[PDB]
């Protein structure tokens, strides 16, 4: 999960208002050119590469009438309805996910409630307690980020294929200077922006801003 | 829905089967569990030996191992509306045709000794990065249960250095 | 040993367990090829369900599957009879395959397997630069495996570590 930034809203979601209208009658081709600008070409919840894409409502469309044509509630998930990860699993799968106890990528930095170890596991952050710990333990459970073998297996490979690359940059740290090494680290953190699991790598590179 | 040459649906016995097939032909072949009583270094050279002897005979082999899959192309796999996978199995490692085509983790999930390494990082990210007593008693148990040569110790000693330098730069700030 | 001895050279498990339990209640087990007809997912939890449902009984099994060896200690592995030099309890099924069974991770016969390693060799044969021949092989890695596979996410991490190595050397 990254910290998506919702800037503007598609114009198409203004001639449609909840109630009389239905989500089906919306031309989703006019929404994607805006979602792709916000979250890039990656899933909002797991940061995989969107190849089988669909539009998900953070709060479902059945338990929350209204908010169905509201821009704030629309994200892009990685499973089309022709799956066992975020999106499809958030509805078919997990059976109780009261929406308050979930991380909204575009309103809550999903780095205070998530830690991506170099083994590809998403464990709650360090030291969280109370309600802040339930948010992490629920977003890791309703958006499967530790219980899907095809995702946990695809993030171990992506986070460990660069582990030898990380160990060298930090190895050549006490020999180099602060400015040059920081520039090299930036260049290494400016290339994961266009790579899968942009945040799993960033946590293996510097930290979850701790 | 089948292919033309291979359709994989996910030594004495194999030789007897080959001899029987050759005798029948000289006078389609749907093998079941091609990897039956075959050491791993006879599974990655079985599909390539079943075509060399028989050039043109459609095969409907069914398998359970991730090794005979690494000698087959993606288009030939048929999971169970059967649907082909989303990775190229031909040439792929026999630890990702298992994870991403058969849903089986590399390390056992039920063995408490496999989690150790992935748990040892947590005891290092909690203490700001440096080692402590509760973490050093899990590093030793990794250096006494996996021997001092193995990848498990080579990854635990890579976490130690990376997180000791990741806390060094953080400290300078 | 005393509990388990694997000598390396769920429905199916049902009848076996049922017969063993019936014989035990009515009153050493030679369990050959405990990986027979078992999906690689049930092979990871076969010896843990036999040391739990049958706590006090000596088991001698015959095995040529890396997964079921990953759930056994090295003290119980008697390969054709000295035990291996690596601990096979919690190790990756790809390192129990290379070091205990002498089977390379990728097939030797498939010429598409010697592409990542050949890529490393070519890239280190030019001092870390993608000149003209390693670039062609890298293009063939992407076109065959995928835009993001294990064989290309590893190839792209070599082109970067080598670039950094060259940059640092040019400064030193
Ligand atoms: Zn996703």
Swiss-Prot record, chain A:
It comes from the Bacteria. One of its GO terms (molecular function) is endonuclease activity. InterPro entries: HNH78-like, Retron_Ec78_HNH_endo. Keywords: Antiviral defense, Endonuclease, Hydrolase, Nuclease. The keyword Hydrolase applies. The keyword Transferase does not apply. Coiled coil: none annotated. Putative HNH endonuclease component of antiviral defense system retron Ec78, composed of a non-coding RNA (ncRNA), a reverse transcriptase (RT), a probable ATPase and this protein. Expression of retron Ec78 confers protection against bacteriophage T5. At multiplicity of infection (MOI) of 0.02 cultures slow growth when infected with T5 but do not collapse, at MOI 2 cultures enter growth stasis. This is Retron Ec78 putative HNH endonuclease. The lineage of its organism: Bacteria, Pseudomonadati, Pseudomonadota, Gammaproteobacteria, Enterobacterales.
From Swiss-Prot, chain B:
GO terms for biological process: defense response to virus; DNA synthesis involved in DNA repair; double-strand break repair. It comes from Escherichia coli. Keywords: Antiviral defense, ATP-binding, Nucleotide-binding. This is Retron Ec78 probable ATPase. The keyword Ribonucleoprotein does not apply. GO terms for molecular function: ATP binding; ATP hydrolysis activity. Probable ATPase component of antiviral defense system retron Ec78, composed of a non-coding RNA (ncRNA), a reverse transcriptase (RT), this protein and a putative HNH endonuclease. Expression of retron Ec78 confers protection against bacteriophage T5. At multiplicity of infection (MOI) of 0.02 cultures slow growth when infected with T5 but do not collapse, at MOI 2 cultures enter growth stasis. The keyword Transmembrane helix does not apply. The chain holds residues 83 to 545 of 550 of the full protein.
